Amino acid sequence: AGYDRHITIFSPEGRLYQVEYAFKATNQTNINSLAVRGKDCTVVISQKKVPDKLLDPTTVSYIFCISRTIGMVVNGPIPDARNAALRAKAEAAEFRYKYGYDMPCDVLAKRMANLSQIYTQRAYMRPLGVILTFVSVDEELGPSIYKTDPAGYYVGYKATATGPKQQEITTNLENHFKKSKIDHINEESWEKVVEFAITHMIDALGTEFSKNDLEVGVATKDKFFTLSAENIEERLVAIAEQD
Amino acid sequence: LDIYTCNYYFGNTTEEKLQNPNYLNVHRVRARIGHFFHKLYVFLSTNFENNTNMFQILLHGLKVWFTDLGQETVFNEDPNAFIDVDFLENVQSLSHVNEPFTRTNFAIRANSLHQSRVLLHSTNRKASKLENLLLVDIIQLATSLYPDIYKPAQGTLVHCMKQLVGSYGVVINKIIPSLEKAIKDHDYMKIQVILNVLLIKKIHRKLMTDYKDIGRLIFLLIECCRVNELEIGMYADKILTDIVIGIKIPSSVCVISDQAFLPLAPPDGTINLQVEAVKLAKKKKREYYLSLLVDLQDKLLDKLDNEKDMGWKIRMFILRFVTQIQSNLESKPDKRAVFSIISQISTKHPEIIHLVVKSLLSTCNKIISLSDYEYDITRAYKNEFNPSFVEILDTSTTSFPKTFTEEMNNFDNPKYFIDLRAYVGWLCWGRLMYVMSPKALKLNLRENELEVLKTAGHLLTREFLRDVTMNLVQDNETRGVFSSGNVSFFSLVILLISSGFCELNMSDLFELCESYYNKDDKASMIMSVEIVAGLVCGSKFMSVSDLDKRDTFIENFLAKCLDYELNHDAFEIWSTLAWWLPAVVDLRRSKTFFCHFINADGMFDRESDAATHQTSKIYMLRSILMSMEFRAPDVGKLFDELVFDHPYDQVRQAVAKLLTTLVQNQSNPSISDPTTLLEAERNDPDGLGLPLKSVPEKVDAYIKKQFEIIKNLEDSVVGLNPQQFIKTDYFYRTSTIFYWIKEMARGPNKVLLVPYLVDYVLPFLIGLVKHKDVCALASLDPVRLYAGLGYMPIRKNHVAAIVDYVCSSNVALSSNQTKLQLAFIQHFLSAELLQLTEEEKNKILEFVVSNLYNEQFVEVRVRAASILSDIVHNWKEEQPLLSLIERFAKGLDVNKYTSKERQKLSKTDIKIHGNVLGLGAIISAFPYVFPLPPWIPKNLSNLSSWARTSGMTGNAAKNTISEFKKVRADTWKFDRASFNTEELEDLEGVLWRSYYA
Amino acid sequence: NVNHWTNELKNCLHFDFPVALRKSLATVYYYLSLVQGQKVYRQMHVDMFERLVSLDDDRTQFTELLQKQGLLLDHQIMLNFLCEFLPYPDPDYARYELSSKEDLQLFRLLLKHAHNAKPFFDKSKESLLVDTMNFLLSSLAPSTMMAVMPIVTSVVPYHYHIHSKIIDYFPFCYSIWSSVSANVAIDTHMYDFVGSISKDVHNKILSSEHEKDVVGVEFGEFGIFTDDQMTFMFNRLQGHLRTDGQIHSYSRTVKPFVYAINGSKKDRFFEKLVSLAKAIETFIHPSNNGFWTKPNAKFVHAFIKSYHGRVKYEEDICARGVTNGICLTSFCHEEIVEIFLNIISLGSQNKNPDIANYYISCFAYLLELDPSNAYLIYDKILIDLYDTLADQFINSRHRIISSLKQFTRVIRFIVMDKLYRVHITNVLSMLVSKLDMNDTNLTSNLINGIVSIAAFIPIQDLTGEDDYISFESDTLPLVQQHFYHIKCGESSKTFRVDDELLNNAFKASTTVFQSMLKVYVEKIFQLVDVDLEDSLVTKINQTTMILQESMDDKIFNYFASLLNRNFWSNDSFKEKDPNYELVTIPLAALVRRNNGLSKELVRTLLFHIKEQIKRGAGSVRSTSEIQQRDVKLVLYLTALNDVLRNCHESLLEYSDELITFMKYLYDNVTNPPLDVITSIVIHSALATLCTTEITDCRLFPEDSKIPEKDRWGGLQFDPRRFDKQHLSFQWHVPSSDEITLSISILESLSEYCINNVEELMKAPRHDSEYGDMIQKYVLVMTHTLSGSSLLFDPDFNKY
């Protein structure tokens, strides 16, 4: 009867009810993330929220290392994020083996988006409640930032944000690439690009951060790594001593 | 002037407003806005033709400027910040209670009244020079080529004709000229658009009233019937066809009780000369209109006669002169039309031909109706139904009832005919009775009408009926079909024939008929028999010497056709005639036709030959006798001639289906007076009425015989078997009688069948221990009929004798036909519940219960209990009830006997099988008592120590506890608590089948 | 032209006129409807007649007053028409055949018209009755069955004479009936007859003239019916509900049974009704659906409409001195509840929600009879509801939604009985907090409850500062004790409480309104982001606007600083495409009641809209969609529209600051989907100055227009509910000052648009940020013409 609300088929106005709902799930964690391009780096900041005093912060991560070169940050329930990370960690290992070069940021995204699409067209499987933000310093395109969503869509951003206060963060960035009129952040060392990404997020969220409320992921050529508890405090100390 | 009044601020039409600076200020500003929208329109259509978004925003700015004048109608209904009057009304109004409203509601209710006083103000006006300029623009837009523009403009030009006066005129005198253009400027999509306009509700409607312009328009839509290239021409046909269905004109003096205008007649003296003046102009306004159509009529017949060949929209014309050369309220029957309408038979096209007939038959039934009305066109709509050949008859006449009866049997010297459905009589006499005269006349008409009919019979050659019926047969091969439209056309040829105009002699339709009878071609036979039905509807047409040439041809023809050699294809047709003809003509207009089917050389009697043949009659004689039901039915013969003994089924069944019908014809109670009648109904035993339809003694005698003739023959099967049974006379009778009962219990004959049940029909039927296997053979379901007679139109006094027949003290007579009478009761009860006197409601229950105990049949002790519950469901009074419970649980209660014994008893003792079956039914008669009665636990407890015993009773006591634990399923979360008794445990065994261990 | 005037007349019935002129008018339309020979808009004329003869034109009955005022109409004309529908010999002429819509549809109209003019057939032509039957009867035969029967039921007048009465003709109906088995093609006419006739006798017996030539028609046990006549119709109705399902519109089929009850000789009838309920019992059960579940429902409702129907017509007559022992007693109302209570309770849980809404709506009809039984119903409904709010039905969907419908169709009555009313604060603050954001349906059925409780209750602190107060200590303890009692089998009659304690409970119960609205507003902003849509978006705004009007200044002035507060500081307009309606409109409704609140609310929407424009909002072009970076600017702009529209005269203060901001909003901000919004500012401000509308809707006025504080059930039953001092509505009437600003604007924006557009007629065909600007000015111009629409005169061009 009224069961086009429960599976991935067409409502009478060409709508996929289950996908629209799947999107609504990406906020359910209540973390926000943003990503930027440098002259030759890429940065992803996410929030870390550890309410339970019984937790171990070191195990609480929405930033995944997919390959030597490629990083991914998810907005969405942890279960679904891992289902996607595991699948990408493997699509990119297979890609290197079959084809002989490391797997490129934008190709991994097209491949997860294609995947995210099948869910969108097959009755029996459900999309995942995640929005995958992929970053790297791809050997042909430079700093890359490519985001896929439960709809099957992927596209590449100068910078981007995702989650609950997504549009407050987004509109901050827009007003800073209207002003430097380019496609990146003209700073050499990634450190200053991480400070900038934290700055423009404090500004946009109107709250300060401590070494414990952030997760930072960084991509340079030949590596993608994540910053430690302390590697961040350093970044914050430097913001505070100029602002 | 002003009656609406809405606080218009600038004073309510006082021209307290005209002397207001603030009011010339305001309109001087709407003028600028108007002249500015035109400034912008011209600036766009010139600089931006290829844009839709601009023109939409302008077209809404005009939907506003033209409408939002007194009121606010776009935006009118958006949810705003006022509580909705319609919502609040639902919340607060109770019905049958005057305005029980809270203060909040009264307040919107009042605001809602103001707001409706504003919208009342009719905004309808005269076009304002500038307003005409903008309406012309709104047309060039609804005449634009972009659907994204012309569709909102059209919707926008309609909100604008609601607002201007005779604006439809402005619109048409712009459309037509710029459609005539777009045609001589070729295949334009501006033609496609102009046609879309002509299909707008408000325009397409005012079209059937524009007599001036619809002249020119139809000829434009015709030129348009050429898809020179598009969806055009498909649209031009839908439109020209829509047109034929509107229009007309009313001359006829409103048959008005002059009291429809008098009560409002002003004192004013002859200042109501005005009325007799209007009467005169709305009378030449009319007569001009009426002439414009005749001018269009003749100007088309021009383009149809003279246009060597236009193709198949040859059809608009014909589809139209027809709803015209036969309208009346004027319409001068043109003879050049009747010529042209017929000379279109030369296109030998199925659709055209079907219509030439449909038209020629109406174009006459109109001229005919001028003679019958004596040119008093008014006389149609006056229910003093003129026709010179109709005659009223007084029915109260002490003597009448036996004129009818002895005049319906009269076929040679017939005094009156009722063509159609004969109502008067049947119930009672007394009314006046509209009837028809013998050897009906033709009547006279003036010369104009005369030369028109001449121009048909001079065109209905031996050759033209040849061409036209041939065709009707071939278009007919696909379908089958009959259409009276065909027959009511042949009666017409007959009127024309021997009234003077055709001269074809009837002996020409006898060949044309004998001609189309190929025992092979079905659609060809259907034409032959369509012809016959015409010759019998052609007695509304003189010559007693032709009505004898026709009575003679018909007894000769029905011979060739029906007297042996008859396929399920003919039978399919003729049998169609029998159900129809007697309803469109009194059959006494023919001595031979009826007195032919009733000539019954068809019903043999025994089988050591091939018996013979068929219902090569029966089912056709019957379907005539069914359609008269009243008239002609003198059948002294048939009753003395029926069979019953017949070996074949197809006949045994048919002799029954016929008698059924023969009985419904002598059962009409037609009484002398309404008064004589109601005095019979008043004095009836049941505070109710007379049995409607009551079988007349001389027949109650016949039937009784057929049942007691079958009781005579019970020696005939003294001991034979199923194979030597179907061959005895006792079976043959019995089978026929059965097929008859089956057909009485169906339909309007039930009230006839009742008196016989108690003595005849139920003693019979239960002719079933008269062999179960004999029924399986000649597939008869008695069980299903006997019991299906539990429901039916029984009357207060008949119930008595029926309950007494069941619950018989002779009961003990039958055997497992016992579980039969017991199922008939279960059904009676459901259809006579609430109608049974607590006396009867008991004679039943004491029978049912006397069966929970009958030694021998275990089969029935159970069917009894299942039924005892149907009773105890409507039995809420607590002392009839609680006094049963006790009667039953005395045969068991406590450990009357120790364990070893229960085992022994449970297997054999009947007095205890009953007691547990019975007490079981009681509990299963209260399925959902939402909070549970404490007599149920305490009495399942008495039943549980017994469902713990394997045997025959201990089994039907497990039934009772599982049946129960099941239906209580969803209410069980709760029922658990009224079982203190750890005899909750005591209910766990209970259900056991082979798959549990 | 006829048809036009026949309408402007229709328009004239809205005021009054002399019964002596109705005599005239009716006579015109009786004979007019029956014209023949031309195109006639009959439906209109039979409707004039039917409205001129209305039997309830605001409690006034014009058929009585027209009988008394000497109206008499020809029956031969009517019957002569209805008889063209009989078999006219010679088929070539028969004009009317049933079966074929176009014809049956006329017949159904004539028949309706006759029913209308049945009472104006000469009561005095003694041989009009007998003459007419002795004719129809002779016309009856199987082939006429269909056309005759209906005629009789609508063209023969209910006469009653010394020798020939109309009930004289009954024994003949129970001759046809009782001869065919259940057949709706027949029955429907029998019930319509013996019923509209039994209704008649009853009506006539009371108050008026107990006669019409014969009070020689005795009532007794079973109305005007024999013992066997009644007996028969009972087992026939049982036949319909259990076997043959043959009935249509049941209102008509039920009449005979209702109007055969005799208040002083019921008993024998109620005995017959009970056994009919005990038969029908199983077929209502929620899990026995079939061909019957419709008939039983449409009947159990049709019967309790048509009973309460009668009662409220008699209680209108014992407000005229005349009891009559035929009348329905307090003890009939009792045995009616006894019968249909399990029956109604089973039906309301039925699987079909429409077939349930029938059984559930019967609770309201029964409670209006204020029977001694009343408690039995309130007892069920309140347990079923309290269980549901305690999640004891969570496994079964229907019980939850059902027992919330039971409770809604009955809220208004609970606010009365001085015991139950206590519960109503609790049950409301419970519904509000249980408003789900995932279950669209549960929420629609909760708002139903919430808005019904607000429609009949004043949100007011009724505490005289009495110290013991508090919701716990004083209300809760009692509510739980009542519930414990009710749950354990006991009823509310057995429930004894001190009139002192029970009035502490009631007054202390009116404290929670504050802490509960903080929770409704919270639930509103959560709903701004849900794909609830339309029907239910509206219904929610009704609940927010009704809740406002039932609020005293103390509470309202709180609610206001709580929308104001939450509207600004909220984290609740994210998700794609929001329901701004649910929050902007409830603001407008604050300004309706308190214009004072506008001066500052508007100036804050403007220094917050200029803020969003200045920081890039509506910078990025798109038809089709509202950019999500705009969503905030769009909130503030909808609010400004919705809130100007209800500003009225308080807008005179900041006139110049508005106009100059509107011109700013159109200089900056171009974007086709924002311009359909910004251009509405001009309308919501012109409409607000010169549109004449209401302003006050409060349940109870001023804060002080004391009927006292026994003022709960909103006077919905008190006869003071409508004396003029209560209904002291406010109304905005446009003053000379407002019209004058009104016009200042019209010309100032009218010029602004025409200039900026006459400028752009130095044509850039490219731009496209050009066609955006011309559309803008043409929308601003347009919405400048509307709202500002009340100052124009249709007729101006004549003058």
From Swiss-Prot, chain A:
Subunit structure: The 26S proteasome consists of a 20S proteasome core and two 19S regulatory subunits. The 20S proteasome core is composed of 28 subunits that are arranged in four stacked rings, resulting in a barrel-shaped structure. The two end rings are each formed by seven alpha subunits, and the two central rings are each formed by seven beta subunits. The catalytic chamber with the active sites is on the inside of the barrel. Interacts with CIC1.
Protein task: The proteasome degrades poly-ubiquitinated proteins in the cytoplasm and in the nucleus. It is essential for the regulated turnover of proteins and for the removal of misfolded proteins. The proteasome is a multicatalytic proteinase complex that is characterized by its ability to cleave peptides with Arg, Phe, Tyr, Leu, and Glu adjacent to the leaving group at neutral or slightly basic pH. It has an ATP-dependent proteolytic activity.
Location of the protein in the cell: Cytoplasm; Nucleus
Name of protein: Proteasome subunit alpha type-1
Disulfide pattern: none
Transmembrane portions of the chain: none
GO process annotations (BP): proteasomal ubiquitin-independent protein catabolic process; proteasome-mediated ubiquitin-dependent protein catabolic process
Keywords: Acetylation, Cytoplasm, Isopeptide bond, Nucleus, Phosphoprotein, Proteasome, Ubl conjugation
Record SMART domains: Proteasome_A_N (SM00948)
SUPFAM superfamilies on file: N-terminal nucleophile aminohydrolases (Ntn hydrolases) (SSF56235)
Designated gene of the protein: SCL1
Keyword Iron: no
GO cellular-component term (any): nucleus
One protein family per Pfam: Proteasome_A_N
Source domain of life: Eukaryota
Record organism: Saccharomyces cerevisiae (strain ATCC 204508 / S288c) (Baker's yeast)
From Swiss-Prot, chain B:
Segments passing through the bilayer: none
Portion held of the full protein: 1147 to 2143 of 2143
Name the UniProt record assigns to this protein: Proteasome activator BLM10
Annotated consequence of substituting residue 996 to V: Abolishes binding to the proteasome
Family of the protein in this entry: Belongs to the BLM10 family.
Role of this protein: Associated component of the proteasome that specifically recognizes acetylated histones and promotes ATP- and ubiquitin-independent degradation of core histones during DNA damage response. Recognizes and binds acetylated histones via its bromodomain-like (BRDL) region and activates the proteasome by opening the gated channel for substrate entry. Binds to the core proteasome via its C-terminus, which occupies the same binding sites as the proteasomal ATPases, opening the closed structure of the proteasome via an active gating mechanism.
Compartment list: Nucleus; Cytoplasm
Domain of life: Eukaryota
Annotated region (Bromodomain-like (BRDL)), positions in chain: 502-586
Provenance organism: Saccharomyces cerevisiae (strain ATCC 204508 / S288c)
Short motif YYX motif, span: 995-997
